[PDB]
Amino acid sequence: GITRDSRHKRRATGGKKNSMQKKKKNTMGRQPANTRLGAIRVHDVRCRYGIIKRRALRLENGNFSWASQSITKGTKILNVVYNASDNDFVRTNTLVKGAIIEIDPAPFRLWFLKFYGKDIASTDYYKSLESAQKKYAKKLEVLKNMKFDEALLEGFQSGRVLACISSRPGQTGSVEGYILEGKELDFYSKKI
Amino acid sequence: ARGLHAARKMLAQRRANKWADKEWKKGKLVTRYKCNPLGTASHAKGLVQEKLGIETKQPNSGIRKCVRVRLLKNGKKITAFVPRDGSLNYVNENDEVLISGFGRRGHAVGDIPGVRFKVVCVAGVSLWGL
Amino acid sequence: GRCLRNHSITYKTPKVPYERERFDAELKLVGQFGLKNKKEIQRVHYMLGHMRTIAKVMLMKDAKDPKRLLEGAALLRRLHNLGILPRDQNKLEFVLALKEENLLERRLQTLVYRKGFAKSIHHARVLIRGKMIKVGKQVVDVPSFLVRVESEPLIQLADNTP
Amino acid sequence: MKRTIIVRRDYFHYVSKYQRYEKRHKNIAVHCSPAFRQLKEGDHVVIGQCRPLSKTVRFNVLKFTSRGTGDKKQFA
Amino acid sequence: ARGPRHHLKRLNAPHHWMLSKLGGTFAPKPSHGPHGMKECLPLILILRNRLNYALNGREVTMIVKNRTIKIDGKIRTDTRYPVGFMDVLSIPRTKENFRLMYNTKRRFCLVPLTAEQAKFKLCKIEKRVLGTGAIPYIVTHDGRTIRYPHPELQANDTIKLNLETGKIVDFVKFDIGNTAMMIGGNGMGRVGVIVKREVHPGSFEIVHIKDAKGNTFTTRLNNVFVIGKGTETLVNLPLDKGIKKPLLQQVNETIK
RNA sequence: AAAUGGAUUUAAAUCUCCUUAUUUAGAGGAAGGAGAAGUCGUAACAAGGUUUCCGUAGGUGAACCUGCGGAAGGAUCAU
RNA sequence: UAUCUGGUUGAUCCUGCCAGUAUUAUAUGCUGAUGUUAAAGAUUAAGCCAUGCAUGUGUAAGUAUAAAGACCAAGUAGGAUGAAACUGCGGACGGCUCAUUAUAACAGUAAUAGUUUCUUUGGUUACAAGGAUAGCUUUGUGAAUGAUAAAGAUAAUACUUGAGACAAUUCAUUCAAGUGAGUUAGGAUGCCACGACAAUUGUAGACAAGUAACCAAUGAGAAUUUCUGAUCUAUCAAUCAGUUGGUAGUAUCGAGGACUACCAAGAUUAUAACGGAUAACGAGGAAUUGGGGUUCGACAUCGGAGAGGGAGCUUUACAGAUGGCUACCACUUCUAAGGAAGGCAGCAGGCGCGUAAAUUACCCACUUUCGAAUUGAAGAGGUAGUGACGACACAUAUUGGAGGGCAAGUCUGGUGCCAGCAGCCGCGGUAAUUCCAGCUCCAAUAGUGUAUAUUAAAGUUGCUGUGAUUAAAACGCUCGUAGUUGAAUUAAUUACUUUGAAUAAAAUAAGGUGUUUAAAGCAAAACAUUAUGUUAAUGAAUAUUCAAGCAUGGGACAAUGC
RNA sequence: UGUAAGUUAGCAAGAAAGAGUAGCUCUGGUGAUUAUCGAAUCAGAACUUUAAAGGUUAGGGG
């Protein structure tokens, strides 16, 4: 099968490399699994030394961390909008590390309502700051100091926030990501 | 080049001045494997195919007694002494014999014109004790 | 190599096979000590040449070198006990002055001839080969047995061998 | 190359039979971080060994000293 | 070489075992455990050769499987158990206690002990790392993992172990005024006092050690094993006391 | 969860072109060596009977001859 | 032993080769009293294989109503012991061969802060549940394989569930101490997946025994990787397009163009790249050497690779396994003609091939490996058989030669430039010192001739160390890059040099020791009339050792200084 | 992609020889004006089928 040895390559001088042995299991490679988007489907791979790798063939949900608010919420994945390596990965909705995806910010908005008493999905969000169990007014003044990037708010109101997958679904069998923020969101939004 | 850092010319000279050695070259390049009726082997084996007799050079007179042999390993046809005395009557023909060579000379030794091989066996117990 | 044991040579043949100068000197030692062939002289020459090489190697070093002192004294001590080198000469340069006669005069066949146990040097070989001669506690049937100084006065006939 | 240079080392090989040395050379592909901006061809460079960073790049530039110029300033 | 090797040819065995080169084609490969392959003495070697208690491997099995041999405080039934450094060895049926120790001739020498000093052992710390839960532990040259130690117990120190309880009794710092027995290269078994410790930033630490007779030599920090403090040992040295007769005194004493 | 259908991965095997290397057949042509005291000459060694030789060009049964320019290893160390 | 001699001439002095000489190792002719030790189908064919064996394993301990327990023995949950079977472990070690392989592998060195099992060793974290399966019984098929189909039951330390209460994984954020050096071992917060310490065994040999994960050791191990080091060849001068680098990913135990997408045009080379040859596995080492060297190393030990040829995979901690499987090519065998398995480069043995290489033996008693374990297996290993490959000691007879080299007959009979001898010069044409024989003696001697090849001789390959006017050989001449070599001079590295560190043995040298001596072996004693003691007896310091790498003192001679 | 002998060194040469090509849905490269506007041309990827220059035009080669 696929091999990862360097005996089949050429030297840095361009000279061909001759053969002394045959293929061996130490340099064994495995067929890639392109984790698409859909119904959950994972497989167990017996790796070397008996350890087990979780090969995620298809996934739909994932846990995403909001860095600023210090929470992590499970969420359904909607679409893959930008893959920095191959444009084919955008159409096929292949889940890989560093793939900018879109998820519905329902639990994050719900968490924000309970934790804060306001709703990001409100188009009058900044106006609702000026206009006011009853101790939520103490928390109310945190936003008159800290602000969100505009592109995040548009995703909240449109129901599609941008997140970056930060795990290896073909190795760990799961999608772990994080919501993009100030400097990263501007860069990745101009790409789209 | 007699210097403490000139070890490349003094090594690439006795590497290209060593091919003009007649006995070193002749035993390095490939003729001992195509142009040798014997090969590496000290002795060979073949079927006598013709009793012959070769004249002598010309400080000398007489007729040498020798054979003609087709060897097994190669398939070549050679000529060879029937050593000392009255031995062409011990070989018959189409017998499997043992060839040894002669030694050396200018290049050819024993039966004077162009013979370099000596029979040592007749499939018997040698053309000495027969 | 193919075997895990060790096998060593003990003699070397001369370079020039035919010399009349060498043939008479060999015969002088053959008759004088009643030796079987010329191999026995060659063994003595090889044995002597080994010691000569060792002394010659140390003689090129410094006089007080630790390597010379250890190996020089070891060579002399073995030579004194073998009886080849008399005890008065305690310097390495006396090893180089040794000859094949010094070593040959220490074979058992020579000593038992000098001790008077046999009439002739050839009688000693037959006496030794017949298990008739005991050295201290221990019978010997090899005439090439080189006797040490301390074992020299322990040579006597056998006492009713079976 | 981008963020990569080629370092040549000149040394002497001792041939025992002739009791003389011969000049030899070897080329090492090393990684040059953008911290060294004034690094050009012909400069003296100290390199250290790290993990394999490419098929051939297994070293890294630690310091460099500018040297004489040859009208061709080929900076990194 | 598809997997681990289970045999060990006689000529490949470590030299300080002195297995006769014509006795057999194989040597006893020591099973893994506390000590490495080349700094250990298999239990079969000790009984058959060093003590003559057995004449072949068959008889060593009978002795060891009879539950008659104790290594440290525990009792082992493995014929090829790796017995290395100061680890004590007790045969109670014969009422004797030894201690596998190095001598000046780069060899493992059985130092006899009384029953009182056979109840403790000297272990060399190898590392000190914070485990999970901020629980520090030390690893000794023996391979023992020891839980919360004294905070002063650093990497290159020496500890005194109570074999009946496993507790730390006494510890010796690795300073420049303490005795040490080399366990490594050319200085195996040599005993001296540390006098200088020069450290090179990149590769290695080399230590200068002065013998009890004024002799001096150098070794890597890997081979230094602190025995005691201020020229006073916590264990009994072998007969030569870790002092090398340079080249002649050994020779003449052997001639005599 | 077994037969089974499909699409990749790694691909044996086989066929067709083309290349390289080695060995080997061939009418005929031009060579070299050895032998047989074969036929024709006398080229060289003496000033070898036209001093010999080198490069080049031409010619001739064959050695070789002739033209141009060199050399002495010349048969002149000399007017 | 730091050695030469015969041959160009009427004679002389040279160059120069041919021949002689000695030694290794392969074959072979003749011959052969012993003891010790010892190689032995590598060379040509990694060609083909009949037959026999080479991997199995049971303790008190996982499971045993065998209709097994007259065999100790008795027996109401199964008495000791227990065949077969399930389960566990092993066959990834060992054994053979050298085809492939030219910076590939291998050796020394260094890294893994870039990975990591298995075994072993230290630790850390319900008064008991659920099905069905073999040996067993019963019915059978096929010519047949280590072929197999139905039904009926029955166990678990097999397969599951389940209380007994954390651990390690991914991701995001954050506080940070050893180390030369780490947002590092570690702690905290939030989140997902995973989730226990047998629902276990000895009534006898309370104490064992067993188990799941997680740390550390074994592990200077395995695997990758760093620096230096390989034979010949220029009638091989240019080579390379995943090729060189970057970013993101993918795959893997993991770094990495290892693979993919995009981007750039790079990488090697006269200091020999890329090609070609090897009758090339690499090293420790072996033969021969005054010094320098030359040649060899399939094969004791270490590393690599392979099982007729490729390829693809299963199990598992470790295999791209072949005394495992699948497919294609070339073979081989049984057959009831329907079909079936097999891979001796394992130990014996056969065919073929060649100049060229041994018994179809016995045993696990030594060394040691595996296993459920003090016991069972082991063509590993040991013993025996053939054995003039070799080495040592030792009786009293063969081999080659008698012109010179080269020690030895101008003895006698035949032979008549014929037969023939002759490594070389040469002798033989009837008076042979050389042919063929008889006698004699020359050399070695249980060995001695021949042939091929290595080494010395060879100062006929030259560094030590050659020759160039006429013997062979100074470019027609000048310019010219790399290369090599470079005047005197001064009160940070490299190179050189001196000590070490660390580094497998075997081998070489060398220290001790009466294997009868010797080659060997690393043991036996010298006496203590010896248990007693020296004695906790020896292990040669055993030194090497070049080319690289590390540390140290010196800076004369050199290079880069800058 | 690949291409020989021969040669007047210009050629032979479209040598010879092999592979690809359809439909549909997309992706990317090549500019102007200062976000808007515009050109046919090239490269690549999934999917589908009756597997694609051939309706017409259109070299047989050595």
PDB file of N, CA and C (backbone and C1' of nucleotides) in Angstrom, chain F residues 9-14 21, chain G residues 309-312 327-329:
ATOM      1  P     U F   9      -6.654   5.951  -7.728  1.00  0.00           P
ATOM      2  O5'   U F   9      -6.291   5.268  -6.335  1.00  0.00           O
ATOM      3  C5'   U F   9      -5.851   6.039  -5.226  1.00  0.00           C
ATOM      4  C4'   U F   9      -5.170   5.175  -4.196  1.00  0.00           C
ATOM      5  C3'   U F   9      -4.028   4.316  -4.711  1.00  0.00           C
ATOM      6  O3'   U F   9      -2.809   5.025  -4.817  1.00  0.00           O
ATOM      7  C1'   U F   9      -5.467   2.991  -3.394  1.00  0.00           C
ATOM      8  P     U F  10      -1.740   4.618  -5.942  1.00  0.00           P
ATOM      9  O5'   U F  10      -1.181   3.213  -5.449  1.00  0.00           O
ATOM     10  C5'   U F  10      -0.515   3.094  -4.203  1.00  0.00           C
ATOM     11  C4'   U F  10      -0.343   1.652  -3.802  1.00  0.00           C
ATOM     12  C3'   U F  10       0.375   0.766  -4.800  1.00  0.00           C
ATOM     13  O3'   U F  10       1.780   0.921  -4.771  1.00  0.00           O
ATOM     14  C1'   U F  10      -1.550  -0.344  -4.018  1.00  0.00           C
ATOM     15  P     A F  11       2.628   0.742  -6.121  1.00  0.00           P
ATOM     16  O5'   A F  11       1.755  -0.277  -6.972  1.00  0.00           O
ATOM     17  C5'   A F  11       2.360  -1.323  -7.714  1.00  0.00           C
ATOM     18  C4'   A F  11       1.463  -2.532  -7.775  1.00  0.00           C
ATOM     19  C3'   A F  11       1.480  -3.307  -9.079  1.00  0.00           C
ATOM     20  O3'   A F  11       2.578  -4.197  -9.176  1.00  0.00           O
ATOM     21  C1'   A F  11      -0.751  -2.957  -8.399  1.00  0.00           C
ATOM     22  P     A F  12       3.508  -4.188 -10.484  1.00  0.00           P
ATOM     23  O5'   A F  12       3.553  -5.713 -10.932  1.00  0.00           O
ATOM     24  C5'   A F  12       4.275  -6.665 -10.170  1.00  0.00           C
ATOM     25  C4'   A F  12       3.458  -7.904  -9.916  1.00  0.00           C
ATOM     26  C3'   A F  12       3.391  -8.905 -11.056  1.00  0.00           C
ATOM     27  O3'   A F  12       4.521  -9.755 -11.092  1.00  0.00           O
ATOM     28  C1'   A F  12       1.226  -8.551 -10.170  1.00  0.00           C
ATOM     29  P     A F  13       5.397  -9.883 -12.428  1.00  0.00           P
ATOM     30  O5'   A F  13       4.368 -10.434 -13.506  1.00  0.00           O
ATOM     31  C5'   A F  13       3.717 -11.681 -13.326  1.00  0.00           C
ATOM     32  C4'   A F  13       2.611 -11.865 -14.331  1.00  0.00           C
ATOM     33  C3'   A F  13       2.971 -11.559 -15.772  1.00  0.00           C
ATOM     34  O3'   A F  13       3.648 -12.630 -16.403  1.00  0.00           O
ATOM     35  C1'   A F  13       0.906 -10.544 -15.240  1.00  0.00           C
ATOM     36  P     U F  14       4.695 -12.340 -17.584  1.00  0.00           P
ATOM     37  O5'   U F  14       3.776 -11.919 -18.813  1.00  0.00           O
ATOM     38  C5'   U F  14       2.826 -12.827 -19.351  1.00  0.00           C
ATOM     39  C4'   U F  14       1.826 -12.124 -20.233  1.00  0.00           C
ATOM     40  C3'   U F  14       2.405 -11.338 -21.396  1.00  0.00           C
ATOM     41  O3'   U F  14       2.744 -12.151 -22.502  1.00  0.00           O
ATOM     42  C1'   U F  14       0.815 -10.011 -20.277  1.00  0.00           C
ATOM     43  P     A F  21      25.271   0.376 -26.026  1.00  0.00           P
ATOM     44  O5'   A F  21      25.552  -0.968 -25.221  1.00  0.00           O
ATOM     45  C5'   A F  21      25.994  -0.925 -23.874  1.00  0.00           C
ATOM     46  C4'   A F  21      25.889  -2.276 -23.214  1.00  0.00           C
ATOM     47  C3'   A F  21      26.476  -3.441 -23.989  1.00  0.00           C
ATOM     48  O3'   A F  21      27.884  -3.530 -23.864  1.00  0.00           O
ATOM     49  C1'   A F  21      24.348  -4.039 -23.160  1.00  0.00           C
TER      50        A F  21
ATOM     51  P     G G 309      12.764 -15.465  -4.914  1.00  0.00           P
ATOM     52  O5'   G G 309      12.096 -14.950  -6.261  1.00  0.00           O
ATOM     53  C5'   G G 309      12.889 -14.609  -7.387  1.00  0.00           C
ATOM     54  C4'   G G 309      12.046 -13.988  -8.469  1.00  0.00           C
ATOM     55  C3'   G G 309      11.241 -12.770  -8.047  1.00  0.00           C
ATOM     56  O3'   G G 309      12.005 -11.582  -8.114  1.00  0.00           O
ATOM     57  C1'   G G 309       9.861 -14.276  -9.250  1.00  0.00           C
ATOM     58  P     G G 310      12.301 -10.729  -6.789  1.00  0.00           P
ATOM     59  O5'   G G 310      11.371  -9.451  -6.947  1.00  0.00           O
ATOM     60  C5'   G G 310      10.112  -9.386  -6.304  1.00  0.00           C
ATOM     61  C4'   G G 310       9.059  -8.822  -7.222  1.00  0.00           C
ATOM     62  C3'   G G 310       7.914  -8.091  -6.546  1.00  0.00           C
ATOM     63  O3'   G G 310       8.238  -6.767  -6.168  1.00  0.00           O
ATOM     64  C1'   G G 310       7.037  -9.589  -8.117  1.00  0.00           C
ATOM     65  P     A G 311       7.770  -6.218  -4.736  1.00  0.00           P
ATOM     66  O5'   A G 311       6.186  -6.148  -4.853  1.00  0.00           O
ATOM     67  C5'   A G 311       5.562  -5.346  -5.842  1.00  0.00           C
ATOM     68  C4'   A G 311       4.092  -5.660  -5.958  1.00  0.00           C
ATOM     69  C3'   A G 311       3.279  -5.527  -4.684  1.00  0.00           C
ATOM     70  O3'   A G 311       2.930  -4.189  -4.395  1.00  0.00           O
ATOM     71  C1'   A G 311       2.712  -7.538  -5.780  1.00  0.00           C
ATOM     72  P     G G 312       2.642  -3.746  -2.882  1.00  0.00           P
ATOM     73  O5'   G G 312       1.312  -4.527  -2.499  1.00  0.00           O
ATOM     74  C5'   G G 312       0.074  -4.216  -3.121  1.00  0.00           C
ATOM     75  C4'   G G 312      -1.028  -5.105  -2.610  1.00  0.00           C
ATOM     76  C3'   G G 312      -1.259  -5.076  -1.112  1.00  0.00           C
ATOM     77  O3'   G G 312      -2.049  -3.977  -0.711  1.00  0.00           O
ATOM     78  C1'   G G 312      -1.248  -7.312  -1.875  1.00  0.00           C
ATOM     79  P     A G 327      -5.826 -17.638  -4.597  1.00  0.00           P
ATOM     80  O5'   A G 327      -5.394 -16.572  -5.694  1.00  0.00           O
ATOM     81  C5'   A G 327      -6.353 -15.699  -6.268  1.00  0.00           C
ATOM     82  C4'   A G 327      -5.697 -14.623  -7.093  1.00  0.00           C
ATOM     83  C3'   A G 327      -4.675 -15.090  -8.113  1.00  0.00           C
ATOM     84  O3'   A G 327      -5.265 -15.581  -9.303  1.00  0.00           O
ATOM     85  C1'   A G 327      -3.796 -13.267  -6.907  1.00  0.00           C
ATOM     86  P     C G 328      -4.506 -16.686 -10.186  1.00  0.00           P
ATOM     87  O5'   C G 328      -3.383 -15.857 -10.948  1.00  0.00           O
ATOM     88  C5'   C G 328      -3.728 -14.932 -11.967  1.00  0.00           C
ATOM     89  C4'   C G 328      -2.508 -14.242 -12.518  1.00  0.00           C
ATOM     90  C3'   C G 328      -1.409 -15.153 -13.038  1.00  0.00           C
ATOM     91  O3'   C G 328      -1.648 -15.641 -14.345  1.00  0.00           O
ATOM     92  C1'   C G 328      -0.458 -13.535 -11.631  1.00  0.00           C
ATOM     93  P     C G 329      -0.980 -17.023 -14.820  1.00  0.00           P
ATOM     94  O5'   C G 329       0.587 -16.744 -14.773  1.00  0.00           O
ATOM     95  C5'   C G 329       1.229 -16.007 -15.802  1.00  0.00           C
ATOM     96  C4'   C G 329       2.731 -16.063 -15.676  1.00  0.00           C
ATOM     97  C3'   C G 329       3.354 -17.448 -15.709  1.00  0.00           C
ATOM     98  O3'   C G 329       3.491 -17.969 -17.016  1.00  0.00           O
ATOM     99  C1'   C G 329       4.300 -16.202 -13.942  1.00  0.00           C
TER     100        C G 329
END
